């Protein structure tokens, strides 16, 4: 008999993550821009985790911008921690806001990680 | 008191690493120049993933080229399916090639997963 196999490493993911989260400060592809705040930003990793965000490039394609004033400065950049990490940071002063946020940015799997916590 | 929470989604890095793996045809910032072949390719995954390729970047800064002829094409194309996936595919007459790419690319779980199987 002749034997081929496919072996899969399932912490690969997390650690390619982790590798990608060193580079948020040259990897930087485009601009956040959030009130009047500009986010330096990984292009393909935003469009990845973000349906929202992978339709506004489609269609709207010299430094590149993805604007988004629905969403305050903080509550983003605890989504971008979310984004390179998996963990989303939780008060209850913040979790309407991150919830709204998530739907907005139609993040699926956020937004049922913070309704399992009410 | 007062509490703030961290939740934690283990399956988020798999799930974003799925939603990059449908990018690989826009996105791709450079080209893996193996053998005379030419492979589009996201340039902070594969920095990300390969420490190699990180120190290659910053050494060797129109499209942008990533020189590599010390590993041939079916073999690379093979690890760039592990990088988008944590699944690598081996034979008999492949597992010693890929261990000396993953060697090569200083992947350094990859060639533990490869010498497991040995």
């Known amino acids: 008999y002749f034997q081929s196999m496919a072996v899969s490493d399932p912490q690969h993911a997390a650690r390619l993550l982790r590798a990608l989260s060193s580079f948020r400060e040259r990897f930087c592809d485009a601009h956040l821009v959030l009130d009047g705040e500009e ?14 965000i992978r339709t506004k490039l489609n269609y709207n394609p010299s430094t590149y911008k993805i604007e988004l004033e629905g969403i305050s400065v903080m509550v983003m950049r605890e989504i971008l921690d979310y984004i390179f990490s998996g963990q989303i940071r939780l008060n209850e002063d913040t979790i309407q806001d991150v919830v709204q946020a998530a739907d907005l940015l139609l993040l699926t799997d956020l937004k049922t990680l913070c309704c399992e916590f009410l």
Chains 1, 2 share one sequence.
């Open 39 to 52: 986010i330096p930003v990984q292009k393909n990793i935003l469009a990845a985790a973000s349906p929202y």
